[PDB]
Design a protein around this ligand. Structure first.
Ligand SMILES: N[C@@H](CCO)C(=O)O
Ligand SMILES: N[C@@H](CCO)C(=O)O
Lengths: 357, 357
């Protein structure tokens, strides 16, 4: 069978990948070799050991990639490189994977001789898994986005920091909350005071997240004023769909909220033509087996369209669908998706599966 | 001096109003009469007692208003009715107040003989206080909105429920969080399990808010598919600006997040003409003394553009300003504002001040 090396399999994303591969019995169809960066398992920095592998799957990160990758291909190695990190997404000899959406793009690359495949930006991937249909019919002129991103996208320590912040806030008024007759503004003043305290743990986010939000993710790109996270919307959406010749505008604001691992997004989709809502809904629900169209009903929306419902599942609900006041060609849409699955580990697991078949 | 009656002054909004009036020494210029609904202070249901007042300020709510209001005006009473509730906002003989934005609209009404003035929708009011300038120059063709609304808009019990939810989530993994070597996915599984537990207190929101979000606020309006909260965007923005003849489209998705009392909003503003960012920024910052333009810089954004910074203050920061990929006439903007102040108590306090001068 194909000899597959795994790097960064112990990290958070790597861990999800390992769990998903086990659940699906993916290890039965390949010969796994595990690497580590520890000096305390082959060495992740042993080029000769990596050179003997047919495929390398890394969830180690960009710094690792930028270091080892060049060296490895510099030895002639002609194997496949599957990466979760963003390091190589924008390279000419690499393809961004999300097979339920761009399978045809993936297949052509395997023929052109493409040997590098990279998982895509979580936000963009979750968007495409939700409204892939609209793009599948060149029905989208542009999309304005507003995200509600989870701590998992930032990292494990960030998730822990969010949780600690939540605890401290409640702890600040634990007794008052138990007293059904206590003043709410008093409670409010105290939690806000704690949130602003110097001892409030905000080292990882650089600001409070629990009980608040942060309208800024990643570095500023002076060229356009977007953060790198927002920049990936236009850049990655079009490379994934392979439309670098007829790019579809995708822009908006990426905001961090206090959710653990599900990214949510509010959309304003300008459609190229006036179409019936019922038809839009059918097109969306038919693109893939994971997207799930939620009726624009309160009770059902509260049960299905939330991080609480989606966390840890492969389901990608999309709802609140209706026409906007700007015109019958303006579509409103809200979606929730797990950041660690379709937003990270899953696309990686699925391309590997293809490569070892 | 003018005889002013106050109803619902003990509730959350009423409490903020009382505090703000005291801080500003507003009681020195009027003769206050306090009412109550308790049978255990005049009776809030004594029409003859209310009839002798020059002005009535109520934060009691819609049910109260719809009950007492008709009866009072049915006796000939020719005084002013200042209300925080939405009950009468859309009546022909009433004006929605937000003086820093529609003072000229307010003045004309006082002449036409308008005797009813109502505070506006929190989200709409906070939007206008932020980007009032753009509207002040008929520079806005339409605006797509995505909100991050606080629990305070729902009520005191909702704020308490959010806080309780946060505590339980952290409590579910308190020890693991203290252990710097513990597994994050283990932590994740436990908090999510608690969030989904039947004993997780979600009676007030009908769903978990802490650690999640709810893409639905208020009742569904079958006619358009919008929730009443989203509906107020178009309805109230234009009545406040008095443009029911040349309405400006305002639509989007209103989502509840785990914040105590600050509403935040991500905007996609389609401008009528191509203008320089620097000029847009100047126009915005000049509309009123409370709006505050935050440089599109990471460090400053994290310190100024958040519920943590704004909570309990009259400041209305607006930042992340830049042009969108859809074109140089597409503006991106993010704002944060306290829901109980400019979103409720302040506009009420300011119109009262005018009426008693
Ligand atoms: N989607 C994640 C990126 C994952 O690394 C985030 O919002 O940070
Ligand atoms: N702006 C508040 C409405 C206040 O009653 C909310 O978002 O619920």
């Amino acid at each position: 069978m194909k000899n597959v090396g795994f790097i960064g399999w112990r990290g958070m994303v790597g861990s999800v990948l390992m769990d998903r591969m086990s659940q699906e019995n993916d290890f039965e169809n390949l010969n796994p070799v595990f690497f580590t960066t520890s000096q305390a398992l082959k060495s992740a920095f042993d080029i000769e050991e990596l050179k003997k592998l047919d495929i390398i799957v890394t969830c180690q990160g960009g710094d690792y990639t930028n270091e080892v990758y060049p060296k490895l291909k510099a030895t002639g190695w002609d194997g496949y490189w599957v990466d979760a990190a963003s390091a190589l997404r924008m390279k000419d000899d690499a393809i961004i994977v999300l097979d339920p959406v761009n399978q045809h793009v993936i297949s052509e690359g395997l023929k052109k001789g493409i040997k590098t495949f990279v998982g895509g930006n979580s936000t963009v991937s979750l968007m495409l898994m939700a409204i892939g249909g609209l793009f599948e019919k060149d029905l989208v002129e542009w999309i304005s986005v507003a995200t509600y991103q989870a701590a998992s996208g930032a990292g494990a320590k960030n998730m822990r920091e969010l949780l600690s912040q939540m605890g401290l806030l409640e702890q600040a008024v634990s007794s008052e909350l138990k007293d059904p007759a206590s003043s709410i503004l008093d409670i409010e003043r105290k939690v806000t005071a704690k949130m602003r305290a110097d001892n409030f743990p905000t080292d990882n986010f650089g600001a409070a997240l629990g009980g608040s939000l942060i309208p800024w993710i990643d570095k500023l790109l002076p060229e356009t004023g977007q953060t790198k996270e927002e920049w990936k919307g236009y850049a990655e959406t079009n490379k994934i769909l392979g439309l670098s010749d007829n790019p579809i505008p995708v822009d908006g604001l990426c905001v961090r909220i206090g959710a653990l691992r599900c990214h949510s997004q509010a959309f304003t989709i300008k459609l190229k033509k006036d179409l019936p809502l019922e038809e839009i809904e059918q097109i969306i629900a038919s693109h893939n087996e994971w997207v799930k169209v939620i009726p624009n009903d309160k009770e059902i929306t509260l049960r299905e369209l939330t991080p609480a419902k989606v966390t840890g599942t492969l389901s990608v609900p999309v709802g609140r669908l209706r026409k906007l006041a700007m015109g019958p060609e303006y579509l409103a849409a809200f979606t929730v998706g797990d950041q660690l699955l379709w937003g990270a580990a899953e696309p990686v697991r699925r391309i590997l599966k293809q490569l070892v078949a």
